[PDB]
Amino acid sequence: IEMLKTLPPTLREKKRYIAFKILYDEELKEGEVVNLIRKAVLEYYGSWGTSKANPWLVYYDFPYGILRCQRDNVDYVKASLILIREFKEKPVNIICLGVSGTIRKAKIKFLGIKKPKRWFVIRRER
Amino acid sequence: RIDINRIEKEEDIKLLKELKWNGFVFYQYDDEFSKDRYEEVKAIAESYKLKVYSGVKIKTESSKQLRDKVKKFRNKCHIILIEGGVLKINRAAVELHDVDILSTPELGRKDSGIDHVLARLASNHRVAIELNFKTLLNKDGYERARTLLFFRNNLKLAKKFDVPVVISTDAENKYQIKNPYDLRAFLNTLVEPLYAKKIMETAYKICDFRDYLMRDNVVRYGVEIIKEEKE
Amino acid sequence: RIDINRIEKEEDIKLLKELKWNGFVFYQYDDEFSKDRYEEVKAIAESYKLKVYSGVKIKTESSKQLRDKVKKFRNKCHIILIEGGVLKINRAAVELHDVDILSTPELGRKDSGIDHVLARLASNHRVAIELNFKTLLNKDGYERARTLLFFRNNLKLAKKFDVPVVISTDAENKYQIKNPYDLRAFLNTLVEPLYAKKIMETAYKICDFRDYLMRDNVVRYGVEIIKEEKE
RNA sequence: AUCUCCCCUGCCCGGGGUGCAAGCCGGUUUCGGCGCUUAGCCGAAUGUCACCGAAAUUACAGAAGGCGGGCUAUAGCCCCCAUUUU
RNA sequence: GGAGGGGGCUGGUGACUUUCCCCUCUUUAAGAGGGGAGGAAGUUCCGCCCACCCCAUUUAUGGGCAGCGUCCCCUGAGAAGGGGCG
RNA sequence: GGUGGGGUUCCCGAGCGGCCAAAGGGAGCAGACUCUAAAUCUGCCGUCAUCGACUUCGAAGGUUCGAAUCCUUCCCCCACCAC
RNA sequence: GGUGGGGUUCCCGAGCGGCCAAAGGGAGCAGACUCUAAAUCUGCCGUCAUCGACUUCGAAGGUUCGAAUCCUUCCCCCACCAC
């Protein structure tokens, strides 16, 4: 088996979760969102900043979305979100709602109302 | 928190109010302005819940005949903007000491934004520098590099001489507008967060001063109240 | 300043000596090593002005039968490297406490570089981590992002536990090699310049220790000099 | 040295077993609420800078119902003890 | 004066953001105020508050803890550390 | 956060405080066997590689006449838990 | 680093310490003129827009009965220089 232990929280990367929206009347696949956010995070950070602020999209079902960040550099990720201009025929709009430390709290502040827990049940049932 | 953009539809402005925005500026970049557009601005401002201050703008005309005609068209509206990469009109625009905010030193010039003598004259005449962002969203990579290099040079020349700075997106459509927290995080990314807050504070205070000037009988900051001897 | 690369021609190494480099390591990534290659290493090292230390390398074999055979082939050469993304062989490689430097946690794994238990066991057994750079020059953009994210994670896990780190380019051709000031400026760009100097100091001291160990009659750091009772 | 009894002294009386992911409620697979906080998360929040001071975010290192004892690893100053020394 | 061992302490004020969080509040929706990780949270060796299940309702019998400081033994540069109580 | 446990040869696994006592199995090498090979058996079995002797039972300290074992500490590896 | 100088109306340019003294030219507007237009002339010439009156001579302070002018300070604009 290939298993890696999670680092202790004094040594692990301090993270934040940015909740945002990709506003347009057009539609997107989540892989297109990952591709555009990788191109933009390169275009604003280089190798140095992308090693610095740790970008990874975690959720995109609706035009809303949730992405993970380092704690000291959420303003850098937001400035990376501003400089979207064009994707191959058209722009997309990226508009941030807020930022929190978890999904249950950022889900209820701007995104929705209830607090879901799906990772536990897909780990224990499957 | 005050934005500068043009009005196209009502749903866009209703989305603007629902986020953070308390007010903004309607942007007239033309030579044909009337009361019908300003009444439509009144209607869309009273549509949901807002207040909008309208301005006028000029580009590429004469040296100081333009200054007199700009004063004459400015006597009807609240605020004003003069844009142009020409240094010759820029000297007169910072010399006439009545323009509120100033834009476009980077795309019509492509050499450097503000001169040292220009920044010292702006300190004596108290004119503010307005930083646009639509220029960042219609360029290429090295063009973004040279443009943000010009903005960082102008940011230092405004920081050392205490020149007032107003950020805006200079938007044109429904989606060109961006968040105020985004612009604050970007100006935090550039140099400092306190100066980033000071830019928004100055952007509020300049419209507050123009409103308090053109609101009542105020001449060279003189307030006149009940039982006037006005002719 | 010690590099780790393979030898192809003499002009490349003559260019290496003319810049800054005082010595380097010849890299044998194969299972067929003889004395002819090492004599050619002697000839090219005595060609202009240099000293070269040769090593051997293994990849993708069994768990601890590989450990015994690796000790048996290591008893002929100076230093050694074991590369592999498998954690199962990595535990034995850091457990056997006789391997000098360790590489490849990032491209065979693509999940995370070093585990916390792995870093604590490396602290007890004193094995060093070698950071390659040819992996940076044969990937794409986000692959560079994930790889340097893994290197910054491993840099923290080596900084907090005082794990020795040796930088190298892991070169393969004439032009894959880079400057030592370049690698120092890059490790300065990542976290710190003092740790960047400490990496080069450790890279010199580990080869100095292996040379001082296999040079004379030294067993568990015991120096024996003139008029020996040696059988 | 180990194990079991009877010979003492003082104190205390419900005796065991599981443990908050215990246990209780709307629901009746699965979920939400109580336990739960002069910090109280749960896909695990407690952010950045400057400075008085010099005890300071620097080393070991992070809560998850709360309290008390013991063990392990060390950052800065203070106090105490020892070898070399003069 | 130099490697080392043991004991004590580990925060306060000011500025930014509710877009770091929670609570309270008024108000043309956003602001103001207060609070926000420690000697070990680690290790799980334990006990108590809190719950359920059985026997029993007993200081009659019986059960649990302790004999500390001191002393003894062992190893260290002989300060110090570990174990024990007739 | 919690309970019941395990770490011994290259891999799976036993082992009373005591003579490598270290059961072992599979593996490697060699012998034997066969036309060749499989299977069975024999010795080395980590080393010298004939008998025999020495080292390793996760690591350190301590008890003892003597530690895989008895005590303490440091670790890791399992199993299962949100409802 | 250095020398000789200049800043006055929308633009080129004069101006004794003194009555918008502010020469002016080009420009705008109006008149006159012409079938229309160019040219010439007339008034406003920055404002009230008939006479006439007020403001600005790069900015501040000071002298004076009174500053474009005289003094001081702060500036800018020219010209040319490495050999």
Side-chain angles (χ1 to χ4, degrees):
Chain A
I1 196 66
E2 293 88 5
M3 293 299 290
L4 285 165
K5 288 185 179 180
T6 304
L7 276 76
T10 61
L11 293 176
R12 75 180 68 186
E13 295 293 327
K14 265 64 187 298
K15 77 279 193 184
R16 298 292 90 193
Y17 288 158
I18 286 179
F20 61 98
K21 186 179 178 180
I22 301 169
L23 184 62
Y24 259 177
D25 293 330
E26 296 292 325
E27 294 292 327
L28 293 177
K29 190 177 179 179
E30 62 183 0
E32 293 178 354
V33 175
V34 173
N35 290 318
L36 68 89
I37 197 64
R38 285 174 184 177
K39 290 181 183 179
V41 83
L42 189 146
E43 194 177 5
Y44 196 77
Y45 276 173
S47 294
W48 184 63
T50 51
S51 178
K52 188 175 182 180
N54 193 0
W56 186 62
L57 183 72
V58 69
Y59 190 76
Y60 185 78
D61 194 2
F62 196 73
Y64 294 116
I66 304 167
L67 187 143
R68 69 176 294 167
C69 302
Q70 288 298 111
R71 191 182 71 188
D72 292 331
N73 296 320
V74 293
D75 290 332
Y76 292 168
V77 181
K78 289 182 181 181
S80 298
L81 293 180
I82 307 166
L83 271 73
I84 288 290
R85 66 177 301 276
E86 198 271 332
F87 179 71
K88 187 175 72 68
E89 191 66 28
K90 68 179 77 67
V92 295
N93 198 358
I94 293 173
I95 169 173
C96 61
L97 297 173
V99 56
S100 178
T102 184
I103 301 298
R104 286 173 61 90
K105 191 181 289 183
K107 186 70 179 294
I108 66 167
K109 187 63 67 68
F110 292 102
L111 294 173
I113 297 170
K114 293 181 181 180
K115 293 180 181 180
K117 293 186 287 292
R118 293 180 180 177
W119 284 1
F120 287 108
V121 69
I122 65 99
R123 283 174 181 174
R124 68 103 174 276
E125 291 291 326
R126 294 180 181 177
Chain B
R1 294 181 180 176
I2 295 169
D3 197 2
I4 297 169
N5 52 0
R6 71 188 72 185
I7 291 174
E8 296 292 327
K9 291 181 181 180
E10 293 180 353
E11 296 178 353
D12 323 340
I13 298 170
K14 289 182 182 180
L15 288 173
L16 288 177
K17 176 61 183 69
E18 285 177 350
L19 295 170
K20 286 298 290 182
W21 290 100
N22 292 319
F24 60 95
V25 170
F26 175 64
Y27 182 71
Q28 294 174 355
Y29 64 96
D30 292 332
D31 296 335
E32 294 179 353
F33 64 97
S34 65
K35 292 182 180 181
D36 292 332
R37 292 181 182 177
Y38 188 71
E39 285 179 351
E40 290 179 352
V41 166
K42 285 185 176 179
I44 302 168
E46 293 179 353
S47 179
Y48 183 77
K49 268 161 65 179
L50 279 175
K51 295 177 183 179
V52 183
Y53 295 101
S54 294
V56 76
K57 184 258 185 177
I58 199 68
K59 186 188 281 187
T60 311
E61 292 293 328
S62 295
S63 66
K64 291 181 181 180
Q65 293 179 357
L66 182 61
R67 179 182 68 188
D68 291 331
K69 293 180 182 179
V70 152
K71 289 182 182 180
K72 289 190 286 185
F73 286 116
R74 187 185 57 76
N75 287 317
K76 293 180 180 180
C77 65
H78 295 88
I79 61 170
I80 201 162
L81 173 57
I82 296 172
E83 294 184 355
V86 179
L87 298 172
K88 187 176 182 179
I89 190 61
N90 197 0
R91 184 176 180 178
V94 303
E95 188 179 2
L96 70 95
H97 64 84
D98 203 357
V99 173
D100 291 331
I101 43 94
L102 183 67
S103 298
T104 313
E106 76 267 14
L107 62 90
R109 177 75 270 171
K110 293 181 182 179
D111 291 331
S112 293
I114 303 300
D115 198 1
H116 186 271
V117 177
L118 190 68
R120 289 180 65 187
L121 192 66
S123 296
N124 288 318
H125 287 285
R126 298 294 297 163
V127 66
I129 302 299
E130 191 272 327
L131 274 64
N132 304 115
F133 197 75
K134 183 256 289 182
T135 179
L136 269 296
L137 294 176
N138 60 6
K139 285 286 184 66
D140 201 77
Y142 184 78
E143 294 291 327
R144 286 179 178 178
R146 185 179 292 171
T147 302
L148 289 179
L149 180 65
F150 289 161
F151 282 126
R152 184 172 290 183
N153 290 318
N154 296 323
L155 209 287
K156 291 181 177 180
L157 287 171
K159 185 177 181 179
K160 296 293 183 181
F161 291 99
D162 291 331
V163 178
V165 166
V166 174
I167 190 68
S168 177
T169 62
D170 198 2
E172 64 182 0
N173 289 316
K174 180 177 175 180
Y175 301 94
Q176 194 67 254
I177 312 161
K178 296 299 291 181
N179 297 114
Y181 281 101
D182 282 331
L183 295 173
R184 184 175 179 178
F186 183 75
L187 295 171
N188 193 0
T189 298
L190 292 175
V191 176
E192 280 180 348
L194 295 176
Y195 190 75
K197 186 178 179 181
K198 185 178 180 180
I199 287 165
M200 298 302 291
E201 287 178 352
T202 307
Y204 182 74
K205 286 181 183 179
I206 189 164
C207 294
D208 197 2
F209 178 72
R210 294 296 295 165
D211 196 1
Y212 189 78
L213 183 63
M214 295 301 291
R215 183 177 179 179
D216 291 331
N217 292 318
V218 177
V219 175
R220 293 180 182 177
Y221 193 70
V223 180
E224 202 279 333
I225 321 170
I226 308 165
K227 293 183 182 180
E228 65 272 12
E229 290 180 354
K230 186 176 180 180
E231 293 179 353
Chain C
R1 294 181 180 176
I2 295 169
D3 197 2
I4 297 168
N5 52 0
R6 71 188 72 184
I7 291 174
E8 296 292 327
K9 291 181 181 180
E10 293 180 353
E11 296 178 353
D12 323 340
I13 298 170
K14 289 182 182 180
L15 288 173
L16 288 177
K17 175 61 183 69
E18 285 177 350
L19 295 170
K20 286 298 290 182
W21 290 100
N22 291 319
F24 60 95
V25 170
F26 175 64
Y27 182 71
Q28 294 174 355
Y29 64 96
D30 292 332
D31 296 335
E32 294 179 353
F33 64 97
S34 65
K35 292 182 180 181
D36 292 332
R37 292 181 182 177
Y38 188 71
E39 285 179 351
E40 290 179 352
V41 166
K42 285 185 176 179
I44 302 168
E46 293 179 353
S47 179
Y48 183 77
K49 268 161 65 179
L50 279 175
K51 295 177 183 179
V52 183
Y53 295 101
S54 294
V56 76
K57 184 258 185 177
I58 199 68
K59 186 188 281 187
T60 311
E61 292 293 328
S62 295
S63 66
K64 291 181 181 180
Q65 293 179 357
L66 182 61
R67 179 182 68 188
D68 291 331
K69 293 180 182 179
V70 152
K71 289 182 182 179
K72 289 190 286 185
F73 286 116
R74 187 185 58 76
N75 287 317
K76 293 180 180 180
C77 65
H78 295 88
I79 61 170
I80 201 162
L81 173 57
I82 296 172
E83 294 184 355
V86 179
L87 298 172
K88 187 176 182 179
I89 190 61
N90 197 0
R91 184 176 180 178
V94 303
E95 188 179 2
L96 70 95
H97 64 84
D98 203 357
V99 173
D100 291 331
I101 43 94
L102 183 67
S103 298
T104 313
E106 76 267 14
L107 62 90
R109 177 75 270 171
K110 293 181 182 179
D111 291 331
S112 293
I114 303 300
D115 198 1
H116 186 271
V117 177
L118 190 68
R120 289 180 65 187
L121 192 66
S123 296
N124 288 318
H125 287 285
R126 298 294 297 163
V127 66
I129 302 299
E130 191 272 327
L131 274 64
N132 304 115
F133 197 75
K134 183 256 288 182
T135 179
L136 268 296
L137 294 176
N138 60 6
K139 285 286 184 66
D140 201 77
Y142 184 78
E143 295 291 327
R144 287 180 178 178
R146 185 179 292 171
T147 302
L148 289 179
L149 180 65
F150 289 161
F151 282 126
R152 184 172 290 183
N153 290 318
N154 296 323
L155 209 287
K156 291 181 177 180
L157 287 171
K159 185 177 181 179
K160 296 293 183 181
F161 291 99
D162 291 331
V163 178
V165 166
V166 173
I167 190 68
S168 177
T169 62
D170 198 2
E172 64 183 0
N173 289 316
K174 180 177 175 180
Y175 301 94
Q176 194 67 254
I177 312 161
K178 296 299 291 181
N179 297 114
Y181 280 101
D182 282 331
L183 295 173
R184 184 175 179 178
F186 183 75
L187 294 171
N188 193 0
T189 298
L190 292 175
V191 176
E192 280 180 348
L194 295 176
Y195 191 74
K197 186 178 179 181
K198 185 178 180 180
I199 287 165
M200 298 302 291
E201 287 178 352
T202 307
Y204 182 74
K205 286 181 183 179
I206 189 164
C207 294
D208 197 2
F209 178 72
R210 294 296 295 165
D211 196 1
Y212 189 78
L213 183 63
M214 295 301 291
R215 183 177 179 179
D216 291 331
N217 292 318
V218 177
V219 175
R220 293 180 182 177
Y221 193 71
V223 179
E224 202 279 333
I225 321 170
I226 308 165
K227 293 183 182 180
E228 65 272 11
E229 290 180 354
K230 186 176 180 180
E231 293 179 353

